[PDB]
Each structure stands twice: as C-alpha cells, then as structure tokens.
C-alpha cells in the first residue's frame, strides 16, 4: 500500500465460471469420463477489465488451463497481479483507517448479452499471507449498473471495497516519541537565568529540530490538499510558538 504515489498492488486469484452450449457431450459414450482440462487459448472466455488501473495489466495474462464439464459449465482461475489506484485520506496519521477500491466489469458487452452475478459477498481469505503492517477489517463486493456516455445500453460492474487499518506501534515508537519528547523543551528557556549566556542556543536548537521533523514527515504523506494531517498542524503551531 503505497502512500506517496497513492497505489495498492495486490496478488489476487480471479475465479470465473460460466456456461456454454457447444462444449457438451454424453459421458456414457466416451468410457465414463466427466471432466477434462483444455488450455484456455482455445475456447471463448469473457473479457474482464479492471477499470481503476494505474500502471496495470488491464486484463489477466498468465492463462492457466481451464476445466470444462460435460454439461458445458466451465471454470477458470487465472492468477494475476493488479496495481489499483485509490485515494488516501490521512488526518489521523498515527492510527489511520483507509478504504481502497477495485472495479471489475466487462469491456464491450452489456446487460442483455453478458451478466455478472457475484458469488459470495466476502472476499475469500483462506490463504492470506499475513503482511504484518496492515490488517483487513472488511472486504465486500457490491453489484452496480451504470450508464455511460457513448452507447445507450447499460453496463454492469462489481465494485470491491477494502477497509484496512494500520497497526500503529512502529511510527509511535519512532516518530511521535522524539517529536513529543523534544516538544516539552520549548517552554523551558524562560526558566534559565539570563546571565548564563545559553538561552538562544536552546531556542535555535529546538527550532531547527522541529524543522527537520516537519521536513521528514513530508515524505510519507501524499501531496493532497483536501486535508492536513493532524500531526503537521501540531508541529506548525509548535514552530510558531518557538519563533
């Protein structure tokens, strides 16, 4: 989950299954076989395009072999990487909770010729590999139709929503502990007596250390302009009161 470029790259296993009508036979006549496995360049397959792409394949491209049943029900699970684009809101930087989406749909057939029906409303996580930094709260998929600008038919699509939190202990122990720890040194220089000759050493060192912490926290957040992060407003008000 890349916050400077606002991207999300996942490794996912797309499961599709459908019917046809010419790929059917009688199992009693061909020595009692039921199911075969033919490679997936030789049949029809539908065209499923991620609409939300940013530096993405825009379709599956590994082409795993397909399972065809006697009755014409075929099924197909090709794996893919996908590089989706989402919008990052960051106000509570220490304990964030983001919402990043995906939008699958068919490219050039409409609702009176092809039709998506979502199967299970969860995203199936029976072999998630535990990434450590982020945990999935929720992962749902909502069915949608939309009418576009070109053509007068309507088009179905399925929008997946991913609600993920950040486990916050690493940025707690490495960023707001030294910032909040040198932030209690700002009010101290008035206690120091003025014939020591050591006051403006302390004011210059506190001002330059908060300036280094603000110019290092401008790396990790994206450069948006709808919000400001709540740590950056505190660092700006502390720099105002130090000067």
């Amino acid at each position: 989950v890349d916050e400077k470029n606002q991207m999300m790259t996942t490794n996912v296993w797309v499961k599709q299954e459908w019917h046809d009508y010419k790929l059917r036979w009688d199992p009693a006549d061909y020595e009692n076989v039921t199911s075969i496995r033919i490679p997936s360049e030789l049949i029809w397959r539908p065209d499923i395009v991620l609409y939300n792409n940013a530096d993405g394949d825009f379709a599956v491209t590994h082409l795993t072999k397909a399972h065809l049943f006697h009755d014409g029900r075929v099924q197909w699970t090709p794996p893919a990487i996908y590089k989706s684009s989402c919008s990052i809101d960051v106000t509570f930087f220490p304990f964030d909770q983001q919402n990043c989406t995906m939008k699958f749909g068919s490219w050039t057939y409409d609702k009176a010729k092809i039709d998506l029906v979502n199967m299970h409303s969860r995203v199936d996580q029976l072999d998630f590999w535990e990434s450590g930094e982020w945990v999935i709260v929720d992962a749902v998929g909502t069915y949608n139709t939309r009418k576009y600008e070109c053509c007068a038919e309507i088009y179905p699509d399925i929008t997946y929503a991913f609600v993920i939190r950040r486990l916050p202990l690493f940025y707690t122990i490495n960023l707001i502990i030294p910032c909040l720890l040198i932030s209690c040194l700002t009010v101290l220089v008035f206690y120091l007596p003025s014939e020591c000759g050591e006051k403006i050493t302390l004011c210059i060192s506190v001002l330059l250390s908060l300036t280094v912490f603000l110019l290092l926290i401008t790396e990790i957040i994206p450069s948006t302009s709808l919000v400001i992060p709540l740590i950056g407003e505190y660092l700006l008000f502390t720099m105002i009161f130090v000067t």
């Binding site: 065209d47 940013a54 919008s87 000759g197 330059l208 300036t211 110019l215 400001i228 720099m239 000067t243």
Partner: protein, 264 residues
Amino acid sequence: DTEERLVEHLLDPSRYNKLIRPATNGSELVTVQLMVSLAQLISVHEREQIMTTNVWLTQEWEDYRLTWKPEEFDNMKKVRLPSKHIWLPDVVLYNNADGMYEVSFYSNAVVSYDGSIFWLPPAIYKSACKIEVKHFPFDQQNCTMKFRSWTYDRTEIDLVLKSEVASLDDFTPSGEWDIVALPGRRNENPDDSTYVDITYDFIIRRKPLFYTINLIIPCVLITSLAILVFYLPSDCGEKMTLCISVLLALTVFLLLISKIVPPT
C-alpha cells in the same frame, strides 16, 4: 450459430487481406474520426517532466468490405470482431517518453451492416510535457498530447476531430491537480502537405495548500530572524551563534527547493 457463419464469412483470409486500406473510387481518403476521453490524471512528475494519464481513445471509421444483407443472416445488425484481425489505422502518441507508442489492450470492435467500425481501447500514456516554473507553488501548467498516424500520411488517411473538447464525465477528482480547460485542435501544415495531427492541451493548476504549509511558512519563520542580531547587545557573547545558524538553515532550505523543481 448464425453469428458463427457471419464471423467465418467476414474474415476469410482468401477474401480479406488486412494489410491493405479500404480505398475506393480512385484513392479517396478514409476518415478516422477520433475523440479522446480522460479517466484520471494519475501523476504529474515535476522532476523528470512526465505526465502520466489514463485515457480512452474512441476511433471510428468507414470500411466497405465488411457488410452483409441482414435478411440473409436472420436480422443481425451489429457483430463483434476480435480486434487487430481487421484493418486498423495506427494512431499513436508522438511526444513519448519510454517508447510505448501503441495502445495497451486491443479490445473488440463493433461492426455494423454499413461498414462503419467503432473502436474504443484504453491506454495508460506517459507524455513528456514542459513545466513552467516561476510561480511555484501557485503555477498553472500546460501539457500537450499529440496524436498523429504512424505509418500513413495526408494523401491516404485523414484525421477529423469529432467534438471540440475532450470528454470529461467519466473522470474522478485528481486531488492535487485540478483542470481548467481541455481544448483540442487539428493541425495541418500548409507547407509540407503530408502532416496532420490532433493535439489536445490539458491546462492544469496546482492546489496550493500543501506546499504552502510545508514550505513557505518555515521559510518565512527563518527569514524573520534576519534583522534580529542588531537588537541583541554585544556583551552576552552570543551574536555569532544566531547569525551562523540563520545562514545554515537558509542554505539547507535553498538546496531543498533546488531538489523539488526540475533543473531547467
């Protein structure tokens, strides 16, 4: 089944050689009406001057050896042909970084009974646009996109704009950069006689909050201590620390503003 007999009839490789162009009547032009439609501006990259966009490029033209009588095939008006199996004029970018010239997907194409072909593939495109840097961070950039044909010229194909603006109703907010206008022009050259292209001009503007809060405010707070070492009496023995540290914080801020902007 009748769709199968039509798709077998239309792409007979004895009948249909896809390397020729559909000229009739003693070398008329074919007219490729294109119009482009944005999806999202992904990123404007100031340091290497690359604008990455994601765009849909609707091209439609006229063919003449892909027709049928619709009574003979039980009232089809409109079929789908696997794209790149038919003829297509190569319409690409021309100001390109990284050498990806053609489109990214090669989807299906929708053939009527007229011979009119419709086509809409997507692309991600990386154009190389020239950054105005004077009023940073309040500036107003202007980036270009130039679509030319790739292998043909002006006596053979003929690009025609469809509508004067690029479309924008299938787009999401780009956040940091907002749009002002998107005109599109057809340039022919009067002198060359073999040169048509369609150039769009994205005119964008930076939302100036974030670079103000993280750059202009600590620069103003550091340069407000420029005039202050004269008001400080000399017997403390601390003038040198204040003016030396003001000059060092000022030169570190000059090098950071030197590493954001491009080196033009």
